Nucleic acid binder design. Structure first.
Ligand SMILES: [Mg+2]
Ligand SMILES: [Mg+2]
Ligand SMILES: [Mg+2]
Ligand SMILES: [Mg+2]
Lengths: 165, 68, 159, 285, 49
RNA sequence: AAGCUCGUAUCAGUUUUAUGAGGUAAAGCGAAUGAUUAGAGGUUCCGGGGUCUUGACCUAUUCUCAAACUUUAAAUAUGUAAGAAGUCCUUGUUACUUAAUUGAACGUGGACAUUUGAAUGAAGAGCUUUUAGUGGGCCAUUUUUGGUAAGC
RNA sequence: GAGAACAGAAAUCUCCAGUAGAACAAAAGGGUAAAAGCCCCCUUGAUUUUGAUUUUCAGUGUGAAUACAAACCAUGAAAGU
RNA sequence: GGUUGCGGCCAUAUCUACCAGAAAGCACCGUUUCCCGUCCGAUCAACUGUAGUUAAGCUGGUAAGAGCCUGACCGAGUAGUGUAGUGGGUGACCAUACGCGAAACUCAGGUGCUGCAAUCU
């Protein structure tokens, strides 16, 4: 009655190799694709193999909530043609997938911007998840109220009319 | 017994050879081990054995030691 | 060379008890100390301020001064062939009330009560403690308790 | 979890495990200057739950905390306020109630009357020359986050206006802008008499009507418009200053009658004899 | 042990004193055990001493 | 050595009663950390040969250890207390403290005698001035470091 | 540990478990989890005047440290520090 | 007796897996004009108690549960140790005399108690 699955948030991640004009150019698309200003991430350490160093500002990402996240998810599922493997589903009830280009969603090519891929990840939960997030009397979710892999897969099949390999 | 006697010459000081009343390398007496084995309280794991206690969950002590 | 720092050789003395780390319970800060109280010293390792020197660990003294968060304690220290008085400024976390005399006050109260009740009736109030006395004569019965004979056991190995 | 992990685990304090008490803040709130001996320190405990506000005056003891006076927002309907028992103006009324109630019990209600001409002016309770000093309490917000315009400082404003001496600054009241170092008395006065709720009712009604019926439905049923709650808050303040004494709600049933009802729905533990029977029966199954 | 012997007034060999038997005095006797001989006097022994 | 102030007075290389402090001996490793023997049952789209072995881990066990490891933890040594400078009742002082004669400290006045607050002892207790020599040590039982050991 | 285009043992993103097995300029030992760690905001008390106390100790000095008094400040809604 | 606010001792209170919960309370939950804070009204802030739900939190119970606590002439007066001898033994070490006295192990029982204020078949 009050344990219906729902989308907590949708985070879009673009892992850029380096910083500079390349990273901020990739940050441009997320501004109008999600209607929110994204945030950038800096590398934890230095490898000297992938081409990054400490605090090099290598990545950019943004998360969205509400029905707008569902609209972006719908437009992102057209690339996969409502088809995902048996994988991509976590044991905690979350699922995600990645794409190779962003223009297919409807974004104009804009040679001044270029071509980028994106990572989509969806976090599923049930009403009452505030108990783990609230400051006072912070607690844990009961076992029967937790989201499992099977429940998310079944929920993913009843809607979107999609199939799992 | 003769094998341990020959080993004494390699050691300084005095050593004694004692026939233990335990069953092998277990800490149970010779007749006590017979009682537990015939009651189905002994299970073999590798070269040693595991015993059954009166403690713990029944669902774990029933799958093990089915004979008891 | 040798090392004689302030907290030398205090590896175990200033440790917390097992499964007793963390913050101090509030009853430590709610106790009231007044000049003349007898207190004992036990340093708390989690409070680095107002910490007594390792010599005074386990010593008992008398409060002579009370401050905002600390008290002043009088300690007699044996130096050479004489005793010298030492004054310590210690925070309340490192001290507690001494029970060596709280029980003595109870006997003082009890002596007066027994002194007063005997004042009207009986002479020889007898308000002095005595050590343990030798046992008096008694009779031991064997009804259902017949003595059982014991003997030394022979030597065995059972290894 | 392994057996070694459980054996070496140190459990926090019970109040810390439940997540209600901040012991870092409590130590500094409760500890008293040791040269003041048994002088109590009084906290103004203000806690906000759903559809309820609680205000208490509490001192500390070894056995436990002791309540000197208490006030609840659900007692407001006896003074005039029946809607919005958790808003900013409700906190002000509850804060005023606990201030007047505490002073009357101590006997200092004639002195330190407070202010009866509130207009959002920041001022402390000054002591009277050649007379007793005002009763002093310290605000205890618990785990509440300090933000300007929050309701917890609304109860602070009411208690200070009620005659109690509470030390505070004005930079956390509504109407303070970080750009300049001053307060706006007009905006603060608006929040005291529910100005922020009145403006919403006017604007919500002129924007959509299905929401103005879903919300504020109690106001429409009892015939209160958006320019009348100004007076009822003023009437409530005068009523509180008239009879601030506490009157308990009449008990329909006695305590022992309540106990008999509750024991019927409470499950009891088993004896050691019947625990052994369950094991024996389970073995034979 | 030297201090206990002084407190019992035994400062030279073949000296003797009477001691009341309590818990406070039985612990004194155990400290000087390898230096003294003691027992339970009789009436004749006390009279002749 | 010279004494001085006093003389029942408090003291004591001691015990007892009450109440503290400690991390050594021992003990422990299917308790943490670090060493360490042996198999057993599982686990890989994630080591490597080979169509099934050897390593890695995980689970329940097993043998043996620690001056610079430890949950537990002695014996012997060690702090304080056992009253007149004490306990109880009433109320005087203050610029300190309290919302407040509230509290804190120091007092006035009244009551309680030496089975007056455990044991034993007490060539009396307390105190001051001044100055000599000495400032190479060594031996024994027990504890113990370096060293094969030493009358080291 | 389970998940996400390039992406792999190690790039970034998400969830779960996690008594500290991390971190706290340095040697080592203590101490610390709504913190003493990480990030952010505001600051100069790392200030003025002289005494008492602890450690080494002759109860000298030096070094270091502890608790107050009388001022003047910083921070916070505040108790406080 | 149930519940809430503030606590005291800080596992008999923790952890794992299940089950139950009348009334009130608590909670989840609804909304974004205003104060306020964010990449995101998720956290934080404000507004309504209205649209809903006991699903979770929460409380209680169950388990030859893990852990924890208490006790025992359980192990054990064992290990260790103060004191003594012109005691034993080449030695290493050990026995006895007067005293003190463990830990592991085994077994049994237990699974929060309680102070202040308010409220409820
Ligand atoms: Mg705080
Ligand atoms: Mg040591
Ligand atoms: Mg040892
Ligand atoms: Mg001799």
């Amino acid at each position: 009655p009050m344990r219906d699955l729902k989308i907590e948030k949708l985070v879009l991640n673009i892992s850029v190799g380096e910083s500079g004009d390349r990273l901020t150019r990739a940050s441009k698309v997320l501004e109008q694709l999600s209607g929110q200003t994204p945030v950038q991430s800096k590398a934890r350490y230095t490898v000297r193999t992938f081409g990054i160093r400490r605090n090099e500002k290598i990545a950019v990402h943004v998360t969205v909530r509400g029905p707008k996240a569902e609209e972006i998810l719908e437009r992102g599922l057209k690339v996969k043609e409502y088809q995902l493997r048996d994988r991509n589903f976590s044991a905690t009830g979350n699922f995600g997938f990645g794409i190779d280009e962003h223009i297919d969603l409807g974004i104009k090519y804009d040679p001044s911007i270029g071509i980028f891929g994106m990572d989509f990840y969806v976090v599923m939960n049930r009403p009452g998840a505030r108990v783990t997030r609230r400051k006072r009397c912070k607690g844990t979710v009961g076992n029967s109220h937790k989201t499992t892999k099977e429940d998310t897969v079944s929920w993913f099949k009843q809607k979107y009319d999609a199939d799992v390999l | 017994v003769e094998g341990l006697r020959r080993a004494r010459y390699k050691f300084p000081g005095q050593q004694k050879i004692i026939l233990s009343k335990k069953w092998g390398f277990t800490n149970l007496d010779r007749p006590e081990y017979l009682k537990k084995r015939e009651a189905g309280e002994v299970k073999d794991d590798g070269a040693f054995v595991k015993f059954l206690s009166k403690k713990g969950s029944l669902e774990n002590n029933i799958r093990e030691f089915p004979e008891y | 060379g040798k090392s004689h720092g302030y907290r030398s050789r205090t590896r175990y003395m200033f440790q917390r008890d097992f499964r007793k780390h963390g913050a101090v319970h509030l009853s430590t800060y709610l106790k009231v100390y007044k000049v003349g109280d007898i207190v004992d010293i036990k340093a708390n390792g989690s409070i680095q301020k107002g910490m007594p020197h390792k010599f005074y660990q386990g010593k008992t003294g008398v409060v002579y001064n009370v401050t905002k968060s600390s008290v002043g304690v009088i300690i007699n220290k044996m130096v050479g062939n004489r005793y010298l008085e030492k004054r310590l400024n210690l925070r309340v976390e490192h001290i507690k009330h001494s029970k060596c005399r709280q029980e003595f006050l109870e006997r003082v109260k009890a002596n007066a009560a027994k002194r007063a009740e005997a004042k009207a009736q009986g002479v020889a109030v007898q308000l002095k403690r005595q050590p343990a006395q030798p046992r008096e004569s008694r009779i031991v019965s064997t009804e259902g308790n017949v003595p059982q004979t014991l003997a030394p056991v022979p030597y065995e190995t059972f290894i | 979890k392994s057996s070694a992990y459980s054996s070496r685990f140190q459990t926090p304090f019970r109040r810390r495990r439940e997540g209600k008490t901040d012991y870092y803040q409590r130590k500094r709130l409760v500890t008293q200057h040791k040269a003041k001996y048994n002088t109590p320190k009084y906290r103004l405990v203000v806690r906000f739950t759903n559809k309820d506000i609680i205000c208490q005056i509490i001192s500390s003891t070894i056995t436990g905390d002791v309540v000197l006076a208490a006030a609840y927002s659900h007692e407001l309907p006896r003074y005039g306020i029946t809607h919005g028992l958790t808003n900013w103006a409700a906190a002000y009324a509850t804060g005023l109630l606990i201030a007047r109630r505490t002073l009357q019990k101590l006997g200092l209600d004639e002195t330190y009357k407070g202010v009866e001409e509130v207009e959002g002016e920041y001022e402390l309770t000054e002591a009277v020359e050649d007379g007793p000093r005002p009763f002093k309490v310290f605000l205890d917000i618990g785990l509440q986050r300090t933000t300007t315009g929050a309701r917890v400082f609304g109860a602070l404003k009411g208690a200070s206006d009620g005659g109690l001496y509470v030390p505070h600054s004005e930079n956390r009241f509504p109407g303070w802008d970080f750009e300049t170092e001053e307060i706006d008395p007009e905006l603060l006065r608006s929040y005291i008499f529910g100005g922020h709720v009145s403006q919403y009712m006017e604007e919500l009604a002129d924007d959509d009507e299905e929401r103005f019926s879903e919300l504020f439905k109690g106001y429409l049923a009892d015939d209160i418009d958006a320019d009348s709650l100004e007076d009822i808050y003023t009437s409530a303040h005068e009523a509180i200053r008239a009879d601030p004494a506490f009157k308990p709600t009449e008990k329909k049933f006695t305590k022992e009658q309540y106990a008999a009802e509750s024991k019927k729905y409470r499950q009891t533990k088993l004896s050691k004899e019947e625990r052994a029977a369950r094991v024996a029966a389970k073995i034979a199954a | 042990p030297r201090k206990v012997l002084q407190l019992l007034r035994l400062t030279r060999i073949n000296s003797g004193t009477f001691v009341k038997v309590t818990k406070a005095t039985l612990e004194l006797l155990k400290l000087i055990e390898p230096y003294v001989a003691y027992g339970y006097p009789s009436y004749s022994t006390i009279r002749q001493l």
